[PDB]
Design a protein around this ligand. Structure first.
Ligand SMILES: CC(C)CCC[C@@H](C)CCC[C@@H](C)CCC[C@@H](C)CCOC[C@@H](CO)OCC[C@H](C)CCC[C@H](C)CCC[C@H](C)CCCC(C)C
Ligand SMILES: CC(C)CCC[C@@H](C)CCC[C@@H](C)CCC[C@@H](C)CCOC[C@@H](CO)OCC[C@H](C)CCC[C@H](C)CCC[C@H](C)CCCC(C)C
Ligand SMILES: CC(C)CCC[C@@H](C)CCC[C@@H](C)CCC[C@@H](C)CCOC[C@@H](CO)OCC[C@H](C)CCC[C@H](C)CCC[C@H](C)CCCC(C)C
Ligand SMILES: CC(C)CCC[C@@H](C)CCC[C@@H](C)CCC[C@@H](C)CCOC[C@@H](CO)OCC[C@H](C)CCC[C@H](C)CCC[C@H](C)CCCC(C)C
Ligand SMILES: CC(C)CCC[C@@H](C)CCC[C@@H](C)CCC[C@@H](C)CCOC[C@@H](CO)OCC[C@H](C)CCC[C@H](C)CCC[C@H](C)CCCC(C)C
Ligand SMILES: CC(C)CCC[C@@H](C)CCC[C@@H](C)CCC[C@@H](C)CCOC[C@@H](CO)OCC[C@H](C)CCC[C@H](C)CCC[C@H](C)CCCC(C)C
Ligand SMILES: *C/C=C(C)/C=C/C=C(C)/C=C/C1=C(C)CCCC1(C)C
Ligand SMILES: *C/C=C(C)/C=C/C=C(C)/C=C/C1=C(C)CCCC1(C)C
Ligand SMILES: *C/C=C(C)/C=C/C=C(C)/C=C/C1=C(C)CCCC1(C)C
Ligand SMILES: CCCCCCCCCCCCCCC
Ligand SMILES: CCCCCCCCCCCCCCC
Ligand SMILES: CCCCCCCCCCCCCCC
Ligand SMILES: CCCCCCCCCCCCCCC
Ligand SMILES: CCCCCCCCCCCCCCC
Ligand SMILES: CCCCCCCCCCCCCCC
Ligand SMILES: CCCCCCCCCCCCCC
Ligand SMILES: CCCCCCCCCCCCCC
Ligand SMILES: CCCCCCCCCCCCC
Ligand SMILES: CCCCCCCCCCCCC
Ligand SMILES: CCCCCCCCCCCCC
Ligand SMILES: CCCCCCCCCCC
Ligand SMILES: CCCCCCCCCCC
Ligand SMILES: CCCCCCCCCCC
Ligand SMILES: CCCCCCCCCC
Ligand SMILES: CCCCCCCCCC
Ligand SMILES: CCCCCCCCCC
Ligand SMILES: CCCCCCCCC
Ligand SMILES: CCCCCCCCC
Ligand SMILES: CCCCCCCCC
Ligand SMILES: CCCCCCCC
Ligand SMILES: CCCCCCCC
Ligand SMILES: CCCCCCCC
Ligand SMILES: CCCCCCCC
Ligand SMILES: CCCCCCCC
Ligand SMILES: CCCCCCCC
Ligand SMILES: CCCCCCCC
Lengths: 231, 231, 231
């Protein structure tokens, strides 16, 4: 484990995702509202999945070597197995908050799968220049997601209860800022141009992951928007 | 790229799926009917997924070598990753058109997963004679799907609006004819008996894919069956 | 095939899953109740999936070698591909029986995915002591599932029709007893401590699989709880 300088950030990430999972699990014990139960189930699964994948990276299972640039490059593939399941769950939290229609939910989840799937292909591609073709396709899929979150959901939240509109607006802004950083870290990190070393890259993804999952969840599950209007 | 004679058909397929995706995306911009939005989302995702997998084959990522018959045989595995997601989406288009019940939808999607999954196992199997055992199981799963589309959905469409009944009947006939060709191309192509060479096999799958996805989508999204009855 | 002593139990399992699939398929022909169709579709898919994965193990495709303990250990990875899809389908049978809320269904299916996913990682892990870390995480996920089936569903079934309450109680008890045996067989078998040899381990999993899928299905599909109350 300790033979890799980035191990400290993988261990911290593992701990923070595990602690986040347990807090949400305990906090959700005393909840019977069927609407609130939906948000607790979605939001608790997110850091639980991330916990297992951070642990796999810490123990060395989620790491492979990819030859490109005449070098064997360490690629943590477990990140994409994490994101494949956690990013659509996070979008479902937002879509259920605004009572989005089914067709829009399917478009979001499908574009998200394309985003993560093409990012994985780009991470494992051995022809250096082709890695950035996949990065560009994946980034186009992300821009579609961000467009929908702004010019489809925002207008839908305003016609909703005030507390669900204000909570959505906050979580929307958090998501757009944090998610946009991921393609940048990829491009300048060891998967892309190799400007930033792997140990610093790992620290950046850990800060982003914890903020986008645990921080996101703390804002959502403390809001009254997750409960139905009741007397 | 150009070192493979089949590259021209992979490049054409990539272009036609990309163009198809963009047309459906633009055409769906001016749509607010929640029913129509469902069909546009399903139908636009189909060629978008196929685009990415054709590109992976063009660039050489979606290709592996499988030893059988005393030879290293080029097997494009990316086809099955495509079909795993696009064939159930196409069946969902048909099932939603006739307002199929949930139990029937689950049976269709499950049989479809078995069809594609066993076809993938057959494509990667190293014992030559066993490849055709998997082909037979996969073909049995397809025949179940075709039976349901005829002796379960057809009777349901007649009790529906006339425009949804006539549109379903057309898309049903297109699907049964085109899908039935796939097991035949597999059997006589490089995955099976090896009668037809890979470059011709690739041309045939490209014609079938574009027809079953883009051609299918053009018929559906030009129909009024996708809109609810409104004044 | 016959070069492996466990082949006899893989062949028996294949036959019993295939026969089970055909019986459920025939029995479900004469069913039009939309509620009953749901249970028949879920319950017939379970042994059909298991059939294909037992066949892959029989023919040698679903087997790999994992080095640990200074030895190349035969690991049947196809079991986890089976369980990944069949265990959530079995939980869906139970959840639909008691009309569970959506949030609870998602929590069950998500915990089940974590259970199977971490068990697969543990089966393929090359550092011997780490294999049991994954076993423990997977077992914690199972205990969560069992808790929900007892202290969330049981109370919900009592407020239901008497026949659905008594049928659920029976299937609940069958599930908790049979599922609990799996982590024990893993721990003492070739994936874990290696006390029980592989051929005996394979026999035990076959008895458990057939009972948990075909036996489970025979109890459910003979009950009147799967039909709506009708005159
Ligand atoms: C009902 O809706 C509320 C349940 O949602 C919340 C239910 C959760 C979604 C269930 C998923 C958690 C499982 C219990 C998994 C247990 C293993 C975890 C990874 C444990 C990690 C923390 C600890 C080991 C440090
Ligand atoms: C509606 C939305 C959900 C739609 C989703 C969008 C999606 C279509 C976007 C594209 C996804 C696609 C790129 C997934 C590729 C997975 C692949 C990286 C797995 C590893 O295989 C890659 C190479 C080794 O580098 O295999 C070496 C050769 C091996 C012999 C490969 C044989 C196994 C194949 C991988 C079998 C295909 C399985 C499916 C891809 C499983 C789904 C994985 C997940 C990442 C989507
Ligand atoms: C709301 O419902 C309508 C949206 O459906 C339609 C929405 C679509 C389903 C969203 C999926 C498309 C994404 C925007 C993916 C973008 C990358 C594409 C693969 C681009 C391919 C064409 C071009 C690069 C040649
Ligand atoms: C309700 C419906 C959706 C049900 C679906 C029906 C489905 C059950 C039908 C059978 C599907 C099954 C054959 C999928 C097999 C995937 C497999 C080809 C992936 C590549 O692995 C094959 C060998 C190399 O040749 O791995 C070499 C050895 C490696 C060490 C393998 C270890 C990884 C395992 C593959 C882990 C299992 C992952 C799941 C199979 C992922 C789903 C893939 C998709 C193709 C279903
Ligand atoms: C409508 O709801 C009822 C259909 O459910 C029941 C429908 C089933 C869920 C459909 C799935 C079965 C498919 C027909 C697959 C056929 C291949 C099987 C694996 C055959 C195995 C048995 C035989 C080959 C020994
Ligand atoms: C809501 C719920 C459904 C959530 C589900 C819970 C889930 C997150 C729990 C953890 C699942 C995770 C451990 C799955 C790992 C699959 C992995 C074993 C496949 C084989 O790859 C392992 C190594 C060889 O040993 O690959 C060698 C290196 C290769 C180069 C690997 C590159 C391919 C990657 C495997 C791509 C990721 C694909 C996804 C993991 C596909 C889903 C598989 C299924 C088992 C979940
Ligand atoms: C909890 C994890 C989250 C919210 C991860 C989000 C990840 C992304 C938005 C990743 C995007 C990428 C691109 C847009 C292209 C480059 C490759 C990716 C996958 C890093
Ligand atoms: C857009 C792609 C489509 C509609 C693909 C359809 C593919 C099939 C219907 C494939 C069927 C197969 C068999 C029936 C057995 C032989 C292997 C397959 C997977 C080619
Ligand atoms: C039809 C198959 C069924 C119902 C299989 C159930 C399997 C389990 C409940 C497996 C549980 C495991 C653990 C709890 C940890 C050890 C590894 C597993 C996956 C065997
Ligand atoms: C979206 C965030 C990207 C900003 C990356 C900042 C990295 C600064 C760290 C110093 C770079 C290390 C280079 C010298 C080793
Ligand atoms: C009462 C609110 C705080 C509860 C404690 C939460 C502990 C989980 C770890 C959170 C750290 C990361 C927060 C986002 C920066
Ligand atoms: C379902 C369509 C299958 C028909 C295949 C027709 C192939 C004819 C092309 C000529 C065969 C090439 C053999 C000589 C190289
Ligand atoms: C107005 C209808 C035609 C629009 C142009 C569609 C261009 C997408 C490519 C379609 C070619 C394949 C059609 C099926 C044979
Ligand atoms: C949950 C069931 C686990 C019980 C396992 C009993 C196995 C007894 C078979 C004899 C053990 C073989 C050891 C000598 C070869
Ligand atoms: C009339 C009920 C029996 C029908 C025959 C079922 C045959 C399928 C194989 C069942 C054997 C396994 C039963 C569970 C132990
Ligand atoms: C194995 C991959 C299957 C999933 C394909 C994605 C489409 C799923 C459609 C689900 C239809 C709704 C069923 C109720
Ligand atoms: C990782 C594979 C999980 C999918 C298994 C297929 C069954 C899914 C059941 C979904 C139940 C409906 C939830 C609302
Ligand atoms: C185009 C939709 C408007 C909202 C999206 C904001 C774009 C942020 C740019 C992200 C940069 C990634 C490289
Ligand atoms: C048996 C259901 C009737 C409709 C299915 C038509 C069968 C077409 C044969 C396809 C040939 C594939 C080898
Ligand atoms: C803790 C929830 C109560 C019901 C679960 C029964 C636990 C059975 C123990 C299984 C042993 C697996 C190692
Ligand atoms: C080795 C660098 C080659 C540059 C390729 C950049 C491709 C980016 C595509 C974005 C449209
Ligand atoms: C090398 C050819 C061996 C023939 C096997 C055919 C199997 C087909 C099974 C269809 C029932
Ligand atoms: C080689 C045996 C090492 C023992 C590790 C046991 C780990 C079990 C963790 C359960 C909390
Ligand atoms: C609940 C605390 C979980 C912390 C265990 C993971 C941290 C790795 C320490 C080496
Ligand atoms: C929108 C046009 C997309 C065409 C790019 C793919 C074709 C491959 C050319 C080499
Ligand atoms: C319907 C009977 C299915 C039996 C075939 C599988 C058994 C393997 C025999 C070698
Ligand atoms: C993106 C930063 C999240 C901050 C988490 C703190 C929330 C406390 C209510
Ligand atoms: C299967 C052939 C499809 C033909 C596509 C043309 C549709 C234009 C309305
Ligand atoms: C767990 C044992 C199941 C027994 C199956 C027999 C059911 C006949 C109704
Ligand atoms: C009005 C809410 C502002 C939230 C933005 C937070 C950016 C990290
Ligand atoms: C909408 C604000 C985008 C912020 C992008 C930050 C990328 C590091
Ligand atoms: C009555 C519609 C006929 C459609 C069949 C088209 C076959 C390619
Ligand atoms: C229902 C007509 C089937 C046509 C099969 C064509 C196979 C090449
Ligand atoms: C295995 C075939 C079953 C025969 C019919 C059983 C009575 C519905
Ligand atoms: C009251 C029903 C008892 C069922 C338990 C069966 C254990 C195999
Ligand atoms: C609730 C009874 C548990 C039985 C466990 C059996 C494990 C072999």
């Amino acid at each position: 484990i300790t033979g890799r300088p980035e191990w400290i950030w993988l261990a911290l990430g593992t701990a923070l995702m595990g602690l986040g999972t347990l807090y949400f699990l305990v906090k959700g014990m005393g909840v019977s509202d069927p609407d609130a139960k939906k948000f607790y189930a979605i939001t608790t699964l997110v850091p639980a999945i991330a916990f297992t994948m951070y642990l796999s990276m810490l123990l060395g299972y989620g790491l492979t070597m990819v030859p490109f640039g005449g070098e064997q490059n360490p690629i943590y593939w477990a990140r994409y197995a994490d994101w494949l399941f956690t990013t659509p769950l996070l979008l479902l939290d937002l879509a259920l908050l605004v009572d989005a229609d089914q067709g829009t939910i399917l478009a979001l989840v499908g574009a998200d799968g394309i985003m993560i799937g093409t990012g994985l292909v780009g991470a494992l591609t051995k022809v250096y220049s082709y890695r950035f073709v996949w990065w560009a396709i994946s980034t186009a899929a992300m821009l579609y997601i961000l467009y929908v979150l702004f010019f489809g959901f925002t207008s839908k939240a305003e016609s909703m209860r005030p507390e669900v509109a204000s909570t959505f607006k906050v979580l929307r802004n958090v998501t757009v800022v944090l998610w946009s950083a991921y393609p940048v870290v990829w491009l300048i990190g060891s998967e892309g141009a190799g400007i930033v070393p792997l140990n610093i890259e790992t620290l950046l993804f850990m800060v982003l992951d914890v903020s986008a999952k645990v921080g996101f969840g703390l804002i959502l599950l403390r809001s009254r928007a997750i409960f139905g209007e009741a007397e």
